């Protein structure tokens with residue numbers, strides 16, 4: 295209770311910023327996450343012994359893949375921290391509790407392959423879950439660990455408040471199916487612009503929380519260039535591995551996933567920045583102005599990709 299986590303000065307300062315990198319020291323990441331919970335939610339939110347045992351079970355059940363790993367899970371959790379600490383009054387006590395835990399669990403048990411490859415491989419999870427195949431599997435994993443003994447971190451909530459938070463976490467983990475981002479944003483764009491957006495409307499809240507979960511998920515496009523550039527390599531290591539497996543089924547993969555098509559990558563990032571990221575953060579700023587720094591960071595990294603095409607690097 296009187297046991298505050300304190301980070302070295304550089305981290306203490308640099309963790310409040312949006313563009314923070316959580317560093318290459320794995321064993322610090324659980325402390326970082328706990329520091330973030332305590333400042334974002336409170337020292338009372340979670341029994342510190344149940345939290346630490348949860349955190350380390352979640353860590354155990356992320357795999358050793360290049361991108362969709364334990365570092366991603368913590369990275370995404372930080373971007374959510376940053377948003378909440380810059381939107382102090384807007385979000386309920388349960389929302390702050392739920393969301394940080396959703397982000398840490400969003401990609402639980404990721405294999406390094408998309409929903410499309412699970413379908414075309416005819417994987418069992420495709421049979422169980424036709425749409426948002428992995429994201430439903432992720433949430434299934436979270437629920438499984440929450441229920442392990444000495445892991446129920448929400449044991450002080452009422453039966454209703456506990457259903458509330460698992461629903462927040464369910465919607466939040468499904469939201470990270472990018473195939474749902476497009477319509478969700480498009481519906482928030484109109485609502486803002488026609489001025490019918492209303493944060494007391496709980497169907498609108500689910501949408502805005504949906505945007506926050508994309509924003510956080512893609513937040514490697516919102517780092518300083520050297521972190522974004524280097525994380526590109528990790529994401530494309532999963533992409534090219536999946537295309538290898540697409541080739542293996544007798545399917546010529548989309549250039550993105552074809553490791554013979556590395557020349558096309560800069561342009562592919564443009565199309566991604568213009569098509570998915572700039573619009574994601576634009577629409578997020580319009581709803582949550584103090585998230586502007588994610589847009590600024592995104593655009594800077596958009597410019598660095600133009601500069602790579604122009605040969606200046």
Ligand SMILES: Cn1cc(NC(=O)c2nc(C3CC3)ccc2Nc2cncnc2)c(C(=O)NCC(C)(C)O)n1
Nearest residue numbers: 472511512514515522523525526529550562563566570
């Ligand atoms: C050519 N191309 C690249 C794509 N995606 C990515 O490059 C990308 N995806 C994600 C996850 C999925 C959200 C996260 C980071 C990413 N890049 C990145 C850059 N720098 C640092 N870290 C990460 C797409 C794409 O998915 N289009 C959308 C579809 C293909 C679904 O239409 N198309």
Ligand SMILES: [Mg+2]
Nearest residue numbers: 400401470471
């Ligand atoms: Mg995912």
Ligand SMILES: [Zn+2]
Nearest residue numbers: 400401470511
């Ligand atoms: Zn993710």
